[PDB]
Design a protein around this ligand. Sequence first.
Ligand code: NAG
Ligand code: NAG
Lengths: 165, 165
Amino acid sequence: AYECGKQGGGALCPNNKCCSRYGYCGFGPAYCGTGCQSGGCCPGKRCGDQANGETCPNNLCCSEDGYCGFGSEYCGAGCQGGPCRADKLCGQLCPDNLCCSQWGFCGLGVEFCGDGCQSGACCSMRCGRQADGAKCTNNYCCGASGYCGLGGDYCGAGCQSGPCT
Amino acid sequence: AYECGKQGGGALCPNNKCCSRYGYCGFGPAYCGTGCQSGGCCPGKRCGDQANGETCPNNLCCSEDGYCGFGSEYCGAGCQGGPCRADKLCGQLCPDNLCCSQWGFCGLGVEFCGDGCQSGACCSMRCGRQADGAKCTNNYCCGASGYCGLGGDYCGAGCQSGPCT
Ligand SMILES: CC(=O)N[C@@H]1[C@@H](O)[C@H](O)[C@@H](CO)O[C@@H]1O
Ligand SMILES: CC(=O)N[C@@H]1[C@@H](O)[C@H](O)[C@@H](CO)O[C@@H]1O
C-alpha cells in the first residue's frame, strides 16, 4: 500500500519525510533525491517564479532562487511563498488554503480563520439556502446545511453549490 | 479508504486540508473542528508547552499560547516551534528532522542538508562499512550501500545499523 504522492492520492508524509518517486515515505537519497515528490527533498523541489507559480509541499518556504526549504535562506529575504518571515497580504486569495483575515493578512488559527475570515479555510462560513444564496469562496462546496467546506460532508450528498459530487 | 491521521497511517492531507476525527481530508467544521488531527484545524491543535512538547503537524507554527497556526501571531514573537521567524541554533538536534547545517542552524534544502550537514534529513551522510563504521544520527538506519536514512530502503534488507527491522 502506497503512502504518499501521486500513488497515494497526494498524501504527504509526516515530520518532513520525503516521498520517494515510488510513493513511499523516508529519508536519504532514495526518498529525498531524484524523483522526490514532497517533504524535505534534496535539493528542494522547484517553486515560485521559477516553476510556474507552484507552491512548496508541506508548507516549506520557497527561496528567492525557487527551491523549497527552511531557514533564513528560504523563508527570509526574497522568500516567494510558504511561511515567509514577511507578513503576507491578501484580499488575491492566500496560497494553499490559508485564511485571509478580516485585516487582510494570510494565516491559520482563529485570528485568521475565525470571526471576520474573508477566504481560505475559514472556520464557519454560511452559504446556500441558509444564507440567502451566498456562494462559497475558493471554489469550496456548500454543504446541505449551509456551511462552506470540502470533502464528502460538503461536496457529497446535499451539496448546494461549488464543485459538488 | 482513509486518507490521513491515525486511521490513514499518519499521513497528512495536501494543501493544509484538515484531517477529520475519522481520518478524511476536507475543510469546514466537520474536518477542522472538534477532533481535527492535522491541517488547518480551527482552533489550531495544541502544541509545545501545552501539548507535552508535541510539534504542530504540517510544519505549522506553535504560538506562545500553544496553538498551531501561521502568521506573525504564530510564527513571530513567542513562537515555540515550527518555522518560527527566529533562527534556530543546533550542533543538539533540530526538531522535526530538520537538517543541522555545517554552521549550526536548522533548516531544509541543500545549504542545510548538503555538504557539512551534521544531523537531521541530510542529503548524503555516509555510514557503515563504507564509512569505517560511522553511526547515523537521529536513530536513522544505515542502508546497505552506506547512506543514512529512514524507510524500507534503509531499515529493511541490508540495514547495517540503527533500528533495523
Ligand atoms: C489576524 C491578522 O490579520 N493579524 C495581522 C498580523 O498578522 C500582522 O502581522 C499585523 C501587521 O501589522 O496586522 C494584523 O494584526
Ligand atoms: C546554512 C546556515 O546555517 N545558515 C545560517 C542562517 O540560516 C542563519 O540565519 C545565520 C544567522 O546568523 O547563520 C547562518 O548563516
